[PDB]
């Protein structure tokens, strides 16, 4: 292990001290430096914790800060919770059908916003192969939606 | 100066304890057993002091 | 208003902001639409930038 | 979730025993025990520093400086404080010109300066406008606060009385308010004229407190926003307020990028204030006291402010919970609102006069 | 927490921790074998404290290292800008009017290759200017004035010389950390731009070539809006149906050049893009001194006035023409004869100066 070697190097150098890999000083160094190794591992995992797309310990705090728990957040899958959080955090865009197709693609689905059939404002969404509530929540104020599956 | 290093640390310890108590205390809004028991605890501490 | 911490960052941001304008106004040297602009105004703008 | 000090001690002692066979580090007052405790203390110190390094990732749990940095990065801009302006009545002896820069000081020490030169020949008391220099909440004063003159000026008496109080002073926002604004921005994503965007636009204007947006209000091309200004006493809107809110939603400049953003051109909004729909409850309480009356009515208004919106329904259970929440009373029998009350989107329910 | 303990403090407190949990009391001057272990433990603690401080400096993007800033940009969506080449004019002369192949190459003395990616046929023996781009991504491939370049592979009836009267321009290296941070903060803060009468002008004007735009809201009633765009840089001012289709496609959907997200028109309203129709007016001014320079000055003044103060669905009084003619000051006497009434038109017709007579 590198941590026991670092602890050994921090010791005084001389003819007295034995730092061979089979001595009692080397036996004790691992037991002594082991804890700090785990602490450094946790401090390194905080780098991954920094983002909500990969957060594990701080998912509850991220969801609270973002007001996440809603329709898009799936039932329990941790990956779905992280995705939903990482999408709502950088959720910003216009009202175009291109942006709405891209938004529905970002959540894993695939839809096509086709032309109307009965009116003008009502727009038809073809879902090929949570989405309904997400679109009804983030839909344009004036327009209305129709849903067709394929 | 070891004699004069104890009060300086005691002041910081007391301040940290006060800050922790203020942060961790949560307001209860009910008038039930929770509120009356909190009242009993506070009045017991005051009785001791 | 700038401390030794933020002086470099703020002046870097201002330098970039002014560099954008200077490059935009200097990249259009000769054009049929630039011919419409008054000469003294263009000089007074370039010097300021 | 850092490990505890006892857990660290136990782990270090177990490691010592595992690496040195036939050893029992948990013995009292021994070298191995002392070394294990020292290492546990050092590990606890780092685990605490790890905890502080965490908890700053998000502005919700962050400290003051990191919260300010997060606000700056996210674009929420602090608004600076404001000065205190007011009318000052100065008595004059003969014709004179008061230059811009003369200072009048209060009895406390706060000075107020004139920002524009004036000329007078009335030989009598006149009224001018004057602004302070502190630019803080201490600037504003009371109804009639006497104040003397600092810089001598020809043909003007030193003392001066202000009949209307100084007002307009304020202070910079707190980090709590900045965090609240940032939390709102993150929680309600901005689109171009979304159902939340209309609410936030109508709320960005001054005075207003709440606003709701009904998409497809009257048809396929109109959306309707209704706002309520509680702070005042009418706790409702006026035609001037409705007109200015509609103008603000129609067009306003963006502080960040400097361009103009607002509602789309094609659609129409037609902002309109809500209409009061009073509800009179019959509540019987066995003890009678004006304080208890005030507590009950305050609880009811807070209930209405929390869980009542235009176009929404109100069950009697909400009222019964609101009245029963009062600590003092003994009986809270409700008689009138037995059935459910509902209203159209144009009219907002209100706790009217109360029958006791 | 903040301000982690110093190494001296760690040494002192670990030594005290070891001293206090033992029965005896160490003398003042001594060299015990537990002191070395205490010092080593303090060094271990101070090493991790520094590691944790570095980790804690990486969360906010304003203080992160370049690699962690790149990670932040990868999460958000901002893409770094790579180094760009440098382009410029090459003045090369041919002997017998040959055709230059698609991938000819020139070399500099330092050893940096320039290439032409195009095909050009020469009509007659003479010097011609061709656009050449460097094959070196960095700033090094950026020459100066009158730099001589030579061919690498000989071409028939092409002498190996290139003068480059105007030096090459370009040669930008990779983006710096501060520039990338500014771009990321722009992406984070830039607000959504829902379809507005102002925003349609920008969306029409962002397309290369388009120089003037106009937006008419509630055209032919509510629910639909009209736009108009023109291109003065070309010889033909008015656009073509291909340009109309291109601008309509750009307005319908495009990626924002400053923010990575996708922007466009509102889903509900109907936009229409129509090319303006010319309604020329022929001035027919009379000038007392007749020469080419004065005619050119008068024409330029009239065209400048038309560029400044003429918009679809507007009126143009002859007083503006009179003022434009009078502003030249190089004349002696002038008279405006054809336009005597206030010219006006509708939205789809744009006023323009026609062929001027007598000058």
Output the DSSP codes for E195-217: --HHHHHHHHHTSTT--EEEEET
Selecting from D1, D192, D220 the residue whose C-beta is nearest the C-beta of A57 gives: D1
What is the nearest CA distance from E160 to chain A, expressed in angstroms? 52
CB-CB contact of D330 with D296 (8 Å): no
For residue D180, give the chain A residue with the closest CA. A65
Residue E306: which of E353, E359, E237, E239 has the closest Cα?
E353
Phi-psi region of A108 (alpha: psi -120 to 50; beta: other; left: phi over 0): left
Residue at token pair 């804690």: E56
The Cα-based distances of E70 to D30, E56, E258 in angstroms read: 51, 17, 18
DSSP state of C35: G
CB-CB contact of A45 with E55 (8 Å): no
> Which tokens hold the place of A46?
């905080």
Cβ atoms < 10 Å from Cβ of D227: 24
Backbone angles phi, psi at E249, to 5 degrees: -65, -40
Decide the pairing of beta strands E127-134 and E86-93: antiparallel
Could you tell me which chains touch chain C, where touching means 3 or more CB pairs under 8 A?
Answer: E
Angle at the Cα of D25 from the Cα atoms of D22 and D29, rounded to 5 degrees: 135
> Which tokens hold the place of E266?
């509102």
Question: Is there contact between C and E if contact means ≥3 C-beta pairs under 8 Å?
Answer: yes
Question: Is there contact between D and E if contact means ≥3 C-beta pairs under 8 Å?
Answer: yes
The resolution in Å comes to 3.3
Cβ atoms < 10 Å from Cβ of D165: 14
Interchain contact, C36 vs E308, CB within 8 Å? yes
The Cα-based distances of E188 to A98, D73, D323 in angstroms read: 21, 8, 47
State how far the Cα of A95 lies from the Cα of A97, in Å rounded to an integer.
7
Residue at token pair 């015990």: E32
Residues of D in contact with A39 (CB under 8 A): 43, 46-47, 50
Q: Which long-range contacts (CB under 8 A, 24 or more apart) does A100-107 make?
A: A100/A135, A100/E267, A102/E262, A103/A138, A104/A131, A104/A135, A107/A72, A107/A83, A107/A131, A107/A134
CB-CB contact of E188 with A91 (8 Å): no
The Cα-based distances of D177 to B23, D76, D172, D231 in angstroms read: 18, 11, 10, 18
Q: Is A133 touching D (CB cutoff 8 A)?
A: no
Residue D193: which of D272, D273, D268, D274 has the closest Cα?
D268
> Which tokens hold the place of E172?
């930008």
Could you tell me which chains touch chain E, where touching means 3 or more CB pairs under 8 A?
Answer: A, C, D
Interchain contact, A51 vs E194, CB within 8 Å? no
What is the nearest CA distance from E301 to chain A, expressed in angstroms? 43
Residues of A in contact with D194 (CB under 8 A): 95, 138, 140-141
CB-CB contact of D85 with D166 (8 Å): yes
> Which tokens hold the place of D36?
């294990």
Angle at the Cα of D328 from the Cα atoms of D324 and D331, rounded to 5 degrees: 50
Q: Is E261 touching A (CB cutoff 8 A)?
A: yes
Interchain contact, D256 vs E190, CB within 8 Å? yes
> Which tokens hold the place of D302?
């807070």
DSSP state of D3: P
> Which tokens hold the place of E295?
């005619």
Residue D48: which of E46, A51, E4, E17 has the closest Cα?
E4
Helix (H) or strand (E) holding C39: helix C39-48
Residues of D in contact with E227 (CB under 8 A): none
DSSP state of E94: B
Contacts of E330 (CB under 8 A, 6+ apart): E289, E293, E294, E297
What is the nearest CA distance from A8 to chain E, expressed in angstroms? 8
State how far the Cα of E15 lies from the Cα of D42, in Å rounded to an integer.
12
Experimentally, how was this structure solved?
cryo-EM
Cβ atoms < 10 Å from Cβ of E266: 24
Beta bridge partners of D282: D355
Decide the pairing of beta strands E224-230 and E270-273: parallel
Helix (H) or strand (E) holding E252: helix E241-252
DSSP string of A58-95, one letter each residue? THHHHHHHHT--SSSS-SS-HHHHHHHHHHHHT----S
Selecting from E41, E52, E194 the residue whose C-beta is nearest the C-beta of D193 gives: E194
State how far the Cα of D151 lies from the Cα of D100, in Å rounded to an integer.
11
State how far the Cα of E96 lies from the Cα of C41, in Å rounded to an integer.
48
Beta bridge partners of E92: E128
Contacts of D61 (CB under 8 A, 6+ apart): A61, D55
For residue A116, give the chain E residue with the closest CA. E268
Residue E269: which of E219, E321, E234 has the closest Cα?
E219
State how far the Cα of E212 lies from the Cα of A56, in Å rounded to an integer.
52
Contact residues, E window 56-85, toward C, CB-based 8 Å cutoff: 62
Contacts of D297 (CB under 8 A, 6+ apart): D351, D354
Decide the pairing of beta strands E150-151 and E285-287: unpaired
**Which residues have a C–N gap over 2.5 Å right after them in chain A?**
129
Chain A and chain D share a number of CB contacts under 8 A equal to 119
For residue D261, give the chain E residue with the closest CA. E193
State how far the Cα of E267 lies from the Cα of A139, in Å rounded to an integer.
10
> Which tokens hold the place of D150?
């600092």
Chain D and chain E share a number of CB contacts under 8 A equal to 131
C-alpha E287, offset from chain centre: 45
DSSP string of A88-146, one letter each residue? HHT----S-HHHHHHHHHHTT--EEEE--SS-SSEEEEEEP--HHHHHHHSSBSS-EEE
D24, D194, D224, D270, best to mutate vs chain A, most A CBs in 10 Å: D194
């Amino acid at each position: 292990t590198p941590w026991q070697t670092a602890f050994l190097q921090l010791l005084p150098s001389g003819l007295a001290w034995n730092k061979s890999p089979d001595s009692k000083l080397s036996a004790l160094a691992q037991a002594i430096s082991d804890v700090i190794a785990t602490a450094a591992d946790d401090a390194r995992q905080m780098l991954r914790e920094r983002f909500p797309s990969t957060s594990r310990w701080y998912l509850g705090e991220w969801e609270s800060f973002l007001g996440l728990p809603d329709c898009t957040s799936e039932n329990g899958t941790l990956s779905e919770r992280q995705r939903a959080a990482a999408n709502k955090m950088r959720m910003t865009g216009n009202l175009s059908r291109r942006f709405y197709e891209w938004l529905a693609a970002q959540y894993g689905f695939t839809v096509r916003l086709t032309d109307s059939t009965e009116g003008q404002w009502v727009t038809q969404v073809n879902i090929y192969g949570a989405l309904e509530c997400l679109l009804e929540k983030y839909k344009p104020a004036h327009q209305i939606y129709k849903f067709v599956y394929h | 100066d070891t004699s004069a290093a104890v009060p300086a640390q005691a002041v910081a310890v007391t301040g940290s304890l006060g800050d922790t108590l203020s942060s961790v205390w949560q307001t209860v809004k009910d008038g039930t057993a929770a509120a009356t028991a909190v009242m009993e605890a506070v009045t017991g501490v005051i009785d001791d002091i | 208003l700038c401390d030794t911490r933020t002086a470099f960052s703020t002046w870097n941001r201002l330098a970039q902001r002014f560099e954008r304008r200077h490059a935009a106004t200097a990249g259009r040297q000769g054009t049929i639409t630039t011919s419409y602009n008054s000469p003294v105004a263009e000089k007074n703008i370039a010097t300021l930038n | 979730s850092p490990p505890t000090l006892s857990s660290l001690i136990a782990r270090t002692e177990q490691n010592i025993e595992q690496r040195l066979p036939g050893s029992w580090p948990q013995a009292r007052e021994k070298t191995l025990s002392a070394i294990a405790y020292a290492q546990a203390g050092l590990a606890a110190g780092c685990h605490e520093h790890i905890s502080w390094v965490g908890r700053q990732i998000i502005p919700s749990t962050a400290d003051e400086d990191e919260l300010l940095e997060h606000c700056r990065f996210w674009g929420v801009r602090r608004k600076q404080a404001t000065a205190a302006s007011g009318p000052l009545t100065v008595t004059t002896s003969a014709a004179t010109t008061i230059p811009a820069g003369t200072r009048w000081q209060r009895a406390d020490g706060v000075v107020y300066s004139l920002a524009d030169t004036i000329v007078i020949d009335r030989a009598g008391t006149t009224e001018i406008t004057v602004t302070a220099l502190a630019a803080g909440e201490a600037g504003n004063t009371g109804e009639n606060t006497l104040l003397t003159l600092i810089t001598p000026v020809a043909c003007v008496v030193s003392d001066a009385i202000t009949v209307k109080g100084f007002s307009g002073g304020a202070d910079i926002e707190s980090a709590a308010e900045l965090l609240s604004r940032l939390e709102y921005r993150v929680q309600y994503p901005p689109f171009g004229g979304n159902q939340f965007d209309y609410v936030r636009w109508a709320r960005e204007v001054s005075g207003v407190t709440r606003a709701w947006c009904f998409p497809t209000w009257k048809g396929g091309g109109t959306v309707g926003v209704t706002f309520v200004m509680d702070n005042r006493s009418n706790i409702f809107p006026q035609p001037a307020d409705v007109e200015r809110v509609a103008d603000y939603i129609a067009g306003h400049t963006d502080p960040i990028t400097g361009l103009i953003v607002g509602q789309p051109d094609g659609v129409n909004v037609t902002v309109f204030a809500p209409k009061a729909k009073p509800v009179n409850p019959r509540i019987y309480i066995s003890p009678k006291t004006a304080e208890l009356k005030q507590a009950i009515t305050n609880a009811i208004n807070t209930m209405f402010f929390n869980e009542v919106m235009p176009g929404g329904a109100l069950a009697p259970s909400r009222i019964i919970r609101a009245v029963a929440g009062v600590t003092g009373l003994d009986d809270f029998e409700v008689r009138f609102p037995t059935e459910i009350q509902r209203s159209e989107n144009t009219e907002l329910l209100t706790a009217g006069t109360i029958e006791w």
